[PDB]
């Protein structure tokens, strides 16, 4: 809402064309570049309308049920902590604004409560909805200790405030991760604030036993009827890393035996699929880090994994891609930007894919921060599992992983770690899937 | 310190023995019940000291490593949004206190900004400061002077208070550098008054919606299991499932040395390297599930008329639960739901924390007789596939594990247990290893079982 309020209706405003254009107007669409012969400094943008992957009758149904499932999702994600709260001006209430948190069914002293010399009597009310208040300061009368509503009354202002330094909140009902919006009040004044109720996060620390690559890194791949390429890969890896474990997910119809020291071969139902096999491979990794390589890759003296290890050891990144070099001699890092822009409510949003990166990774020449990369990368195993390779993407997929991970996964890309590359209804289905899964109406590729 | 500050040193205080005992004193330990013959109303508590799984050397080492990796983890988790901020009393500054959020490298109008100063003054001025973004004011209110549009520091100056406040209604924040999930603590200020507040900078969460296809069980549910050289039990299981659910997919992870053929309609059989193990096989099975929900069953189970999956589906369809366990009935006729409570208590800094396991539940699940909320359950359960994958079956747990899953999920996974959905049950160095693993993984020194 931009429209001027009554109180300020008279006050004149000239719109800043430039800045108002920065706001999300929930009206995005996806348009193709003008067609024909291209121009040198222009990139051709091409649009995909995912709504056209449905029968117009089915489209309505899909949009409805997608909206319904989304409303359900909201209700199980969102917290009173996410409410817009406005701090009142000119209140004598001093209260914690953020960063007050308790474990479920635990207790804490509440910081920073006070009432800001000598009056009649001073009284403050505390109200909670998922917990109970407790504290005795000489001179101060308490009403409601061990209840959701607590009154503190004291002729001593210093006293009242000293007792406030000793006010405790206790979570009274068990929930996993929520919050309780408390009310702190005095005569003619009201303040809302939120205590977060949650468990501390699982830190998932790795035992240890430069860098021990065998201890830190598992190599994961997926193959299908390409045993020649796969064996060349394993041979090449062994030329530089003799004891690193290689996990191989395999959905071949008549699987050959693959074995050797530190190789683990997993057989899947014939044509179970690509991402399913990737999900399989990662689920078997016990090391801090996993390296994804395609079955058609070859290690060279340029595949210096230590450098990728270094990056993840020394930076907050979760995933760091290398570069893949074609036999044509060109090496790509496939640095991609993925952003979702708000579209019409219930049509869905618009995905924008474009080549590029966000910024250089300070301290690490040749490395940048981006949204997606080529399928040669080292990553924290847990973060990869957290995002997952959606087993439904069975045939042709790549960026969809980075899209599933978008914002959750800290992505980087280093050009100096290099691996060599050895020389439909599915499309429609994926369009329907991505429409539903990610609430998209369309996408542009660039 | 409990100690009073100088300002308040003169004030007398009574220690509530009862209340002080509620606080975390970072000093837990784990002690066994007395030995000998038990008494009827008493439950035997048994302690495990995890630290005894290491030599004094290794203990020292591991504590160090663990503390270092923990500090690392903290630094990549924690945010300015976690800082304690205290709202000033008697300030003319009105500002958003929580719930203001922007996507990285995007922009928003900042809600609720205003200066509630008294009218009559010669000039009104407000300062805005950011650290990861820049201010702009969209439409310009006539009478207001702006300094710093498109910079991290912005000044609004106006003779008219009305004008200033109208201008504040139009202030925008833009994120200027890309990060995935962080926050920026802004400063809003006027003469002799200061207000801090935090804008969260993050992407909206992946909603991961499932097409729906009362309830189509084949669409909503995949059944997952893991077997090892027990094809008799497994075939009985599949036969029993098919007696009630002809087209539900059964995913079977298998680490047998010489695997038999399992196949039949809607069966997916996955072969693992010999003896890769228990949780690894569970992790494998779940990684292959495409449905909104997964049902875990052991290879030694049997479906009966009592295995009415629809009821478990109903629970997850109608409640915020992520996982809902059933009951497993022994051939002795007793059915267990194995409702467990798991809690960690803060221990001495760098010895680690104490895990308390005890039989029990938190409360009844309102609206669903026979169902409770708890921390862990027996290995018969329906769950949201994504949440199960989010927690994972640690592939390191190769032999003997159960509650370890619920512990890995503790806090993250919303657990329920219904007594009325029932399945039948057909008639060391590794211990030390697991103890060392649990020590690091969960920063624990000891545990008690009850
Ligand atoms: C590295 O890990 C391997 C295999 O996991 C182990 O056998 C070896 O002792 C480790 N090496 C070092 C230098 O710690
Ligand atoms: C349930 O879903 C399955 C799996 O795709 C489908 O083949 C079957 O037709 C569905 N049953 C009904 C009646 O919805
Ligand atoms: Mn290829
Ligand atoms: Mn058994």
Residue numbers in the entry:
A (entry chain A): 53 to 168, 171 to 189, 192 to 265, 272 to 485, 511 to 533
B (entry chain B): 53 to 265, 272 to 485, 511 to 533
What does the paper say about this structure?
The localisation, activity and abundance of these glycosyltransferases is tightly regulated in cells to ensure different ganglioside levels are correctly maintained. β−1,4-N-Acetyl-Galactosaminyltransferase 1 (B4GALNT1) is a key enzyme of the ganglioside synthetic pathway, responsible for the synthesis of complex gangliosides. B4GALNT1 catalyses the transfer of an N-acetylgalactosamine (GalNac) from a Uridine diphosphate-GalNac donor (UDP-GalNac) onto the glycan headgroup of the ganglioside acceptor substrate. B4GALNT1 is a type-II membrane protein with a predicted domain structure consisting of a short (7-residue) N-terminal cytoplasmic sequence followed by a transmembrane helix and a 56 kDa lumenal domain.
